[PDB]
Design a protein around this ligand. Structure first.
Ligand SMILES: Nc1ncnc2c1ncn2[C@@H]1O[C@H](COP(=O)(O)OP(=O)(O)OP(=O)(O)O)[C@@H](O)[C@H]1O
Ligand SMILES: Nc1ncnc2c1ncn2[C@@H]1O[C@H](COP(=O)(O)OP(=O)(O)O)[C@@H](O)[C@H]1O
Ligand SMILES: [Mg+2]
Ligand SMILES: [Mg+2]
Lengths: 70, 493, 50, 468, 49, 466
């Protein structure tokens, strides 16, 4: 509708994975304007920036461990 | 979880479009990106429509348009508690001494409304600065706000650090906030605090001159939040819970200059001397948090020692008069006295303590009232001293006694004196037990007398200290004990 | 004392390098083991969180 | 009602309301703020599309945009009546002392009321005895007339106010109201509580006959900006029913300063030195309510802080025309330890007229100003050349002027901690007699050092005789 | 040379490398199931440094 | 990168870049000028969508809106290393002397670096023995501390500048940096080239032992603003090499004025005399990398032009906030003393305290200042009454003050209008004892006029023997 999702997962996603992601967005609208940047540096997750809210489950616990250890 | 993007990085102020559900003083994050491993924070203050201007707490050189930001869900706050003791920290609470991460369980918001009016009590307990002149003529009580105002290199930082050093066994937690000072000066100050063992009960908040003006504006508030944590909750020091804290805001003139920069770069209208209209409110909301809470509200206290630097001995400027109207007294350090050898330079005529004269050990007031009287006599007769000994004999003796007292007040750096030593010395000086001592030898006489008491007569010092609180300090037993001690010392000399 | 400080200065860079390398190798273990453990099975955690 | 916050600029909150339910100009809108306690903002300007600009009057540093705003529909109403006596209130009228809240049955009045009309003004005026020599001689206070003490930071404004309260707040013949706006919460209040509860007129302390509103400096701008009006609303009820009211407002300058800060946040164009364009209007709105009317009298006694030592600053400049008796405290006089520090030349009064204060009083005061002037004119001549180049009569007047300067010094009961001398209450008649004797030539032989911190001339003579 | 010897001891995986990698994996990736599918040898397989 | 110029207003341009890859603040965007040369502009602000406001730091007269703009991705790169020794540069680091370009193999560091961290600072202050007699005694330098020199068009400023480099090379590493902030093209650049190249010590020109950076009068405000940071960047290489470096900044007040002009052009509100609102922060960016670190140290000496006679002026006030010593060249003593004309009463130093320079040095310095103050007080009496009305026990002190004001002369290794006297380098240890003995009655026999450029008390005895 007007919400915009910005998904960024490590590896490029197949069509079925993309459709699963769109079904994941049924909590807001189902099919919002979604743009899939790759960002291969991040690993093991996807950053879903629905609207102005982000969801971080990708690489950032390990990088928090880096932040504390370094 | 809530995010926004920088749309313009201005003069130390990012704009942060689209960051709704951000509170009016939130601390935003700017999470690290390529080329910047660490996060640098900012304070969202102008929460206007479709834009949230935020002051960047750090160098703005590192952020860029389109950079993500993440509101932390917290008003601007700093870590507080016992873990801060002995740590040199950023205004944000991040350590800079390199000893390791700051351990803390709770964080207190900076920039809060001071406890109030009913939540207060007249100061009764003294703060022993360790300087004879300050402790005898400008008494400082716990919870009092005493401005240390001077003229550039006069000894203001020296007085503050002497005070901090003297609070060793005094059950006090010192805080030293360096605002705009040179990093070399703060390093030297921390070294002085460490070599004398005063770092084990001292917190240091450092916002040096190179640091962005966003820092040096929250530095005194960070230090004051730490001091408030000590004041209300308290920390364990030497195994005893201490709810009294002493905070040296250091140069608040540089704090006002930093806030002037922050305001003018925000395009706020200038006021008198180009300062914003709310610079008085800045210093007042800062300093009014330094209070002496009554027994119902914990009974703790927070002593503030703001430092103001005057230009060409001009105490009638804008910021100095603001802080004089905020604080409870003045320790005015004169440049002429400082250059004339009176190194604890103190304009006794106009240095005053509105409150805290009652918060003095009864021995100190009973011995120092006549000291103040004699110093007033000397200052009155200095004008008449222009005549070449044409005045009468007893007033010549008064002038000589005043000169001896002035030499006595002269005290070397980094050598605070316990209250028992101070009162014994002033008893000696005021009972006419020094009139035979030549003027240049008075400082050595004092040092030798104190060494004699430390070595030969520990019991006299213990008895003076134990009997310092009674209503009539010159009791016969302590009077005769100190009389015997001084007569023995003078016979030996 | 100054020679001890200077040796620590070189050790400080070495210590930071060692810490960063250890943490980066731990991360790369997840990155390398990700293909075998599952390349794109991480969406399950995100669905529950979102 | 039921608006939403659009913008949060400092303590100026912009809120949007339904087009047909916008608040009025001075209504009090509330943010729920959670936790069961609310933030009461005062509207200031009605913008377009039900948009209004409101002054927070509170912390306002933890609230987001889009928060619900509730329009009370009425301005800030504060309790009035005998229930307010012996109590301590916020700017909002909520008590902040330990006692319980004011019950609903107590009348609530808006803090934004029209001042008394011209027909209601009371022109009657007579001397108000204070016990302070320089104030009673040079600028006699009026019973039912506005007076203010101007001074910088270190000079003794608050000590003068405290001695004044300790002197005249026992024989009130009525109630009193205190308003320490933007003042230190240490001395401004909780040290004045101690003395107001220590003083006991008759089975009742001075505090028991006092309403007290603070809004101390710690508070944000809105509280300091409306606390004066809250205190005036407290006092006006007692004035209207005939009780004589003593009104002490502290540092009216912080009222003006809070107005300036709020105006800067409000987007108004700054006037002169960063001050609000509506300086005179705000000042008049506050000060025209401080008037003794036909129904009752208010004996206002204000204090004013001049930025540094600047007397041409817009805030004191606007204050000066709103007074009957002006007092100026000089930094130079205070630095000389002449601590009452009132400048006789810069201090005036309307009732310094021989018909009102008396012919001998007027003659003595005018002579004590003429002599003081002569010294100010010869100040540089004495400064560089010396005292000997003056004529004999000029030399005599200079010595008498220095003696007069020293003689205005007076120990205070509240200032006993600084100067060990006990306080001295000098009646106006004794002040007039003492200065008439000093001008007549009596006391010329006495050294000037014996006029320092004394009462009437008899004390000076006794000190000289004891010194032989 | 002393730092070179200490760094050689550390680069020797048995000092801390495998233990730290396993601890980080169990803490972040999986609930004590870091190996999950395969990764039995892959674990520290490419931990060259 | 690859933006386009959007707007040109004087020396303040605005270049539009893509929404991504916008230049950061102080990113030194570069504009090709249709030839080998180019215009380097420093980004000072980010606006709108990809628009960055930058200061020209050049002619900006041949430009047209729409020209290609190249983003360098970092602050103004500055060549560093021994390749910069004996070379003269402008703010951008390009050489402005006759020699060729520096070349690509030489390291280039960002001009905008952070100061040394808190843990790197030196806890204890140490004297920087200069070799002078009056300065090493009355206004001692601080290793890694800022020092001011006043007097305007006095005498002995330049000779002291060259002598300090000569001595620092003799005692410390020797490498030096001259930051000619607002340096006149005629008076301050060619003449100082000739003075440095002609001045020689141990078969080495002082020019070869120094690197000179010149932000000229004619260059826009940005160049004069950042030339000091360019000089700091060149000095910090040698500091990081562990060497002791002396940084000379000519008229730090011109750095302040360049900052004020840049702020005015950027549209920022003025501050308290019309100065920049960021006066303290700008003066802290500079003069805070000038510190003594664990590895090396950058001592400094900054000429300061006090606006009119107002030292309380925000500019000299913020400079004094960052100063560790002051040297006051005075015109009256400059009437005849073309040797270092430092006014001992007006020249102070923070480090001159018993705890640091020792008790003996403090005692001797205080006694010298006391004697000179007594002479200053009795100067009017001598002028009016004469030597006869002046009583005993003060005539001795007046003669001693004449001799000691004459004994603030130093024979220099390198000097203007070389007098032929052999160069001498007198440590503080020698100076303290020499002046102590001069104050101890010795030397009362030799007449006052034979103290011109003697150097040491042992040399005083040797001169008296002849
Ligand atoms: N009581 C004292 N006895 C001897 N020397 C002193 C004393 N107090 C200060 N000094 C010396 O005075 C000089 C300036 O002292 P200090 O560092 O306190 O200055 P300041 O007033 O804080 O000035 P600045 O604005 O430069 O920080 C230092 O050399 C310090 O050692
Ligand atoms: N009667 C007096 N005797 C001695 N000192 C006085 C007297 N009145 C005022 N002072 C001095 O004035 C100071 C307090 O001034 P204050 O009333 O607080 O002014 P302000 O409120 O403007 O700060 C005290 O430090 C005190 O020394
Ligand atoms: Mg200082
Ligand atoms: Mg008081």
């Amino acid at each position: 509708r007007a919400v915009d999702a910005s998904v960024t997962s490590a590896i490029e996603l197949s069509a079925e994975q993309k459709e699963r992601i769109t079904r994941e967005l049924q909590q807001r609208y189902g099919d919002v304007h979604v743009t899939y940047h790759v960002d291969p540096t991040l690993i093991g997750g996807l950053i879903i920036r629905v609207g102005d809210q982000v969801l971080d489950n990708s690489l950032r616990a390990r990088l928090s461990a880096i932040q504390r250890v370094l | 979880v809530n995010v926004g993007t920088v749309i313009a990085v201005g003069d130390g102020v990012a704009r942060l479009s689209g960051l709704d559900q951000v509170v009016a003083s939130e601390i935003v994050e700017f999470p690290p990106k390529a080329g910047r491993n660490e996060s640098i924070y900012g304070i969202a203050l102008n929460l206007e429509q479709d834009s949230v201007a935020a002051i960047i707490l750090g160098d703005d050189e590192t952020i860029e348009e389109g950079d993500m930001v993440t509101s932390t869900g917290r008003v601007i706050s700093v870590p507080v508690g016992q873990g801060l003791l002995g740590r040199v920290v950023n205004p944000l609470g991040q350590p800079i001494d390199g000893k390791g991460p700051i351990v803390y369980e709770k964080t207190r918001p900076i920039e809060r409304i001071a406890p109030g009016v009913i939540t207060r009590k007249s100061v009764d307990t003294p703060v022993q600065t360790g300087i004879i002149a300050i402790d005898a003529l400008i008494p400082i009580g716990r919870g009092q706000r005493e401005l240390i105002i001077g003229d550039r290199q006069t000894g203001k930082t020296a007085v503050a650090i002497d005070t901090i050093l003297n609070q060793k066994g005094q059950g006090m937690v010192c805080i030293y906030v360096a605002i705009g000072q040179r990093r070399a000066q703060v390093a030297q100050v921390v070294g002085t605090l460490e070599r004398f063992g005063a770092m084990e009960y001292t917190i240091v908040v450092s916002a040096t001159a190179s640091e962005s003006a966003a820092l040096q504006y929250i530095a005194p508030y960070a230090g004051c939040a730490m001091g408030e944590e000590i004041m209300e909750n308290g920390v364990m020091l030497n195994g005893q819970l201490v709810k009294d804290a002493l905070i040296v805001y250091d140069d608040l003139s540089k704090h006002a200059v930093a806030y002037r920069q922050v305001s003018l770069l925000l395009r706020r209208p200038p006021g008198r001397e180009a300062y914003p209209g709310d610079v008085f409110y800045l210093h007042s909301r800062l300093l009014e948090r330094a209070a002496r809470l009554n027994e119902e509200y914990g009974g703790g206290s927070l002593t503030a020692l703001p430092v103001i630097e005057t230009q060409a001995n001009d105490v009638s400027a804008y910021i100095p008069t603001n802080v004089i109207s905020i604080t409870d007294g003045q320790i005015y350090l004169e440049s002429d006295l400082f250059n004339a050898g009176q190194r604890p330079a103190l304009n006794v005529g106009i240095s005053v303590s509105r409150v805290g004269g009652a918060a003095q050990t009864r021995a100190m007031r009973a011995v120092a009232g006549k000291l103040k009287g004699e110093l007033a006599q000397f200052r009155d007769l200095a004008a008449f001293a222009q005549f070449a000994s044409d005045l009468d004999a007893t007033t010549k003796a008064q002038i000589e006694r005043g000169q001896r007292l002035q030499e006595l007040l002269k005290q070397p750096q980094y050598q605070p004196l316990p209250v028992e030593d101070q009162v014994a010395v002033l008893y000696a000086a005021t009972n006419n037990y020094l009139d035979d001592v030549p003027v240049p030898l008075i400082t050595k006489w004092r040092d030798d007398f104190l060494a004699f008491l430390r070595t030969a007569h520990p019991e006299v010092r213990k008895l003076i200290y134990d009997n310092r609180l009674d209503r009539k300090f010159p009791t016969p037993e302590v009077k005769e004990a100190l009389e015997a001690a001084i007569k023995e010392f003078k016979a030996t000399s | 004392a100054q020679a001890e400080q200077e040796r620590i200065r070189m050790l400080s860079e070495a210590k930071s390098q060692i810490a960063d390398l250890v943490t980066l190798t731990a991360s790369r273990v997840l990155g390398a083991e990700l293909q075998a453990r599952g390349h794109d099975a991480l969406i399950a955690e995100s669905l529950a969180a979102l | 009602a039921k608006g939403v916050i659009q913008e949060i600029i400092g303590v100026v909150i912009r809120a949007k309301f339904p087009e047909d339910e916008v608040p009025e100009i001075y209504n009090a809108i509330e943010i729920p703020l959670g936790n069961g306690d609310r933030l009461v903002c005062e509207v200031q300007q009605q913008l377009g599309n039900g948009v209004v600009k409101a002054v927070a009057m509170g912390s306002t540093d933890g609230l987001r945009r889009g928060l619900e705003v509730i329009d009370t529909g009425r301005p800030i109403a504060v309790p009035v009546g005998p229930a307010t006596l012996g109590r301590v209130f916020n700017v909002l009228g909520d008590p902040i002392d330990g006692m319980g809240p004011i019950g609903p049955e107590v009348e609530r009045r808006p803090i934004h009321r029209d001042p008394p009309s011209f027909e209601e003004q009371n022109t009657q005026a007579q001397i108000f005895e204070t016990g302070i020599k320089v104030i009673d001689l040079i600028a006699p206070f009026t019973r039912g007339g506005k007076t203010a003490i101007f001074g910088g930071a270190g000079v003794g404004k608050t000590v003068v106010i405290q001695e004044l309260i300790a002197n005249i707040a026992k024989e009130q013949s009525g109630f009193s109201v205190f308003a320490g706006v933007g003042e230190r919460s240490r001395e401004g209040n909780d040290l004045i509580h101690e003395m107001k509860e220590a003083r006991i007129d008759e089975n009742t302390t001075v505090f028991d006959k006092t309403v007290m509103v603070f809004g101390q400096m710690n508070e944000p701008p809105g509280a300091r900006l409306r606390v004066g009006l809250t205190a005036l609303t407290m006092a006006e009820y007692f004035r209207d029913e005939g009780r004589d009211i003593l009104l002490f407002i502290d540092n009216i300058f912080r009222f003006v300063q809070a107005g300036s800060e709020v105006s800067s946040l409000l987007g108004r164009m700054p006037s002169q030195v960063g001050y609000q364009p509506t300086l005179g209007t705000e000042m008049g709105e506050l000060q025209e309510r401080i008037t003794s009317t036909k129904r009752g009298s208010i004996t206002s006694m204000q204090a004013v802080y001049v930025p540094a030592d600047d007397y041409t600053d817009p805030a004191p400049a606007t204050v000066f025309s709103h007074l009957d008796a002006t007092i100026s405290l000089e930094r130079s006089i205070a630095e000389r330890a002449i601590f009452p520090a009132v400048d006789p030349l810069a201090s005036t009064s309307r009732i310094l007229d021989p018909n009102i204060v008396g012919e001998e009083h007027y003659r003595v005061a005018q002579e004590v100003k003429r002599v003081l002037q002569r010294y100010k004119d010869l100040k540089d001549i004495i400064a560089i050349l010396g005292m000997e180049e003056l004529s004999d009569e000029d030399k005599l007047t200079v010595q008498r002027a220095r003696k007069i300067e020293l003689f205005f010094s007076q120990p205070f009961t509240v200032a006993q901690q600084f100067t060990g001398r006990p306080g001295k209450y000098v009646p106006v008649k004794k002040t007039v007699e003492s200065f008439a004797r000093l001008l007549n030539g009596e006391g010329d032989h006495i050294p000037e050092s014996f006029f320092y911190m004394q009462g009437d001339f008899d004390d000076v003579l006794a000190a000289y005789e004891a010194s032989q």
